[PDB]
Amino acid sequence: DPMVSKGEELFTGVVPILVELDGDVNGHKFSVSGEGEGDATYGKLTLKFICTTGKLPVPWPTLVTTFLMCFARYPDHMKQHDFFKSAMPEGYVQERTIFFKDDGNYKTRAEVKFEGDTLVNRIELKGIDFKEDGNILGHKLEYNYNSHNVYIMADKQKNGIKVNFKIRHNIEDGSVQLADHYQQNTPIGDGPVLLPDNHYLSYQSALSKDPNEKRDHMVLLEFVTAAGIT
Numbered sequence: 724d725p726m727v728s729k730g731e732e733l734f735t736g737v738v739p740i741l742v743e744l745d746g747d748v749n750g751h752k753f754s755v756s757g758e759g760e761g762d763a764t765y766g767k768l769t770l771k772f773i774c775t776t777g778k779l780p781v782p783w784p785t786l787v788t789t790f791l792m793c794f795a796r797y798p799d800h801m802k803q804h805d806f807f808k809s810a811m812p813e814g815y816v817q818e819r820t821i822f823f824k825d826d827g828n829y830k831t832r833a834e835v836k837f838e839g840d841t842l843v844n845r846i847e848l849k850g851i852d853f854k855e856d857g858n859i860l861g862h863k864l865e866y867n868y869n870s871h872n873v874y875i876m877a878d879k880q881k882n883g884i885k886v887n888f889k890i891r892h893n894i895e896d897g898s899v900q901l902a903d904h905y906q907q908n909t910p911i912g913d914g915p916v917l918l919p920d921n922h923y924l925s926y927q928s929a930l931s932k933d934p935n936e937k938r939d940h941m942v943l944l945e946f947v948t949a950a951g952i953t
Contacts (some may be wrong), residue, residue: 726743726917730808733837734763734793740770741843748850749827749860751780757790759943761842763808766796766947774939781850782864783941784892787928788821788904789831791844795924795947804919804952806875806884806908812837813912815883824901827853836911858892858900865893868928872951877918883909884919896952921949 742757759770768791772783779786793807807815814836821829833846853860871890878885886906891899910916929944 724803726809726915727802727805730802730805730811734808736764737762738794739841740768740791741838741841742846743945744786744790744846744848744850746850746935748781748829748848749853751860752776753780755779755786755790758913761791761794763794763796766794768794768943768945770943770945771936771945772935772941773936777939779939781859781911782862782892783866783930784864784868785823785829785859785902786848786941787868787930787943787945788835788890789819789846789848790943791835791842791945792817792908792924792947793835793842795949797949800951801922801949803917804922804949806877806917806919807835809915809917810908810910813906813910813914815910815922817906817908819907820905822903822905823853823857823859824903826857826859826898826900827851832906834911858894863895864900865895866930867893868892868930870925870927872923872925873908873920874923875919876921878907878909879901879918881907882916882918883935892933914927920952922949924949 744755757772797805819831890902927946931942
């Protein structure tokens with residue numbers, strides 16, 4: 724299928740990644756840069772993020788979903804359903820509202836696209852209505868991350884997809900902070916894309932620290948596989 728081929732040739736081996744985030748949460752401004760690489764054959768991403776502005780005013784875990792679905796591994800039988808690679812190289816927009824239960828919300832806009840050989844994710848994040856001593860501004864979330872599925876449906880009126888899911892962030896007392904994610908993606912180009920049957924992406928994420936890094940940062944290892952079509 725030459726449409727499938729185009730995504731294949733773009734993603735074949737290891738692809739370098741650059742992420743840039745400008746953020747404002749309740750007027751706490753911050754920027755983050757990330758670098759690493761992805762190998763969509765294995766659904767594997769390795770990234771390190773750095774707050775270039777000093778202290779990150781929110782927990783690193785609350786930014787993981789914001790900081791590359793084009794690196795998911797689609798099983799061979801599901802390649803007709805891979806919207807994300809289909810939109811490349813021109814790319815797609817990914818927009819979210821993320822509602823932290825009993826606290827504020829993030830609103831994000833990203834563009835994901837190639838800049839030469841490099842796969843880039845440029846993000847603007849605005850958070851509003853946060854509690855200054857709540858879980859997020861009060862830094863009460865554990866530095867870890869649970870596995871979740873992400874359910875994808877076509878958004879056919881918009882030549883795009885719609886994605887809905889819940890993340891449960893562990894809080895230091897043992898409870899959980901729900902982050903309800905609403906998401907929409909649309910192609911940046913005027914070219915055609917693959918519109919998928921309902922399916923999901925299974926995410927595993929592992930957070931660590933670079934023992935030689937003094938700045939405020941996060942090392943993220945993520946495995947992403949599509950499923951849910953036999």
